[PDB]
Symmetry: D2
């Protein structure tokens, strides 16, 4: 019982393709203040390796695949994201890395707040002191 959740999204499917709509405090359990997206990824060059005190996130794999590795201080879960109709809710005080990006994989992140470099914990031991 870690603070993440798999979100299965409802798509409007038709001849012209698929559409997924995600709204503030409905499919998204917070108000979107920011989105960012990561592209030109490579499988040998992983990303993240950080935690956040207050910031909450929803991760959608727009293109390709990756392994999200989550850690709350004790046991740690590997979640593979590889389709656009699934999102990963990442709660508070959660260490995450993203590895094994398929070449050119495109990740989309929906953020509960504006970018704040100070509130990044980029040191795993510092994270563990903060958890305990």
């Amino acid at each position: 019982h870690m603070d993440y959740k798999i979100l299965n999204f409802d798509a409007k499917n038709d001849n012209r393709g698929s559409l997924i709509a995600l709204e503030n405090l409905k499919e998204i359990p917070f108000e979107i203040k920011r989105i960012y997206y990561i592209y030109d990824t490579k499988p040998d060059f992983p990303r993240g390796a950080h935690a956040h005190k207050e910031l909450e996130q929803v991760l959608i794999m727009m293109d390709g695949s990756c392994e999200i590795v989550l850690n709350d201080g004790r046991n740690d879960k590997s979640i593979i994201l590889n389709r656009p109709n699934i999102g990963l809710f990442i709660g508070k005080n959660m260490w995450r890395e993203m590895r094994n990006f398929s070449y050119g994989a495109k990740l989309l992140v929906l953020a509960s707040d504006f970018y704040n470099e100070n509130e990044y914990i980029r040191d795993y031991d510092e994270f563990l002191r903060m958890v305990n």
Copy 2:
């Protein structure tokens, strides 16, 4: 001088790839209430063919290409979206269609409000009466 704008985004480029961050009332000229994204597109099956009174939008081509065709009531502009570091701001009282989607092209839309089927103008003549 129609109510659209090309947005050239700043990317943090490094070994692990590219990251673009877009924030409420900074890179985005409104507060995000909703995002939706369109995938499994086809070049022979176009989309949109509608206008909106109040709703404002930012369009980002996450994958592949398409032609956005804009119309405000008089002259009409074709804008080709084909890279993730460019967004298209679509203002108020603007008719748009999206055609010539590359097979499997992925469009991302950032919306200034919650989904409201009533405020869709899906009739071009109705749109023109409303403009004049």
Copy 3:
């Protein structure tokens, strides 16, 4: 009539996706000796700008779109490739460019012979001289 053909491919479609199969002297009207693919393309960085007296090619956009521009010494013909089930045969004495690549668009090329840098014409003026002998 310029020496190119649009090839419409038959796909085997099920709930697991689509398969296209291309064989020597059947859907491909030559013997594949080499294939090449291009990726990490950019809308603002076009490619091609060469011609070949002998080499026949078949072009397939596996991902995204680009604009193939074909010239046999008269006017440019643009052919948009934006789906994987269409191919473009390009015959002999054909100058070609490929521009307006969607970002990260991928092109597959089935070629009729082994790579010879010597047999490349990479100058348009050289190509017109060659076509006006």
Copy 4:
């Protein structure tokens, strides 16, 4: 030692992107008679589940990732393909599956011979009987 090889390809990289070239009896250790590509793949809809006495293949993920599962009648070997500059040679008397496709992932296959549905083994039990003669 199972009859597969990981192929590392040399790419020509410039500011216009990357090109990989694959030739008969050079980077590909057979003569290409046919190529096929698969697209509109789904993580939950795996493909393959067949073997071939004669047909040699080279697999390349041009877009996205999948898990190739290889079996010559002993234990499964998983090989992840997730970049376009790696290929997977699959020799004779090899059962293969391809699963955990990223959504819309695209696979290119260079094949040593023309398509023969007759020469396909699409039953695993049939494959073990064949490998235990």
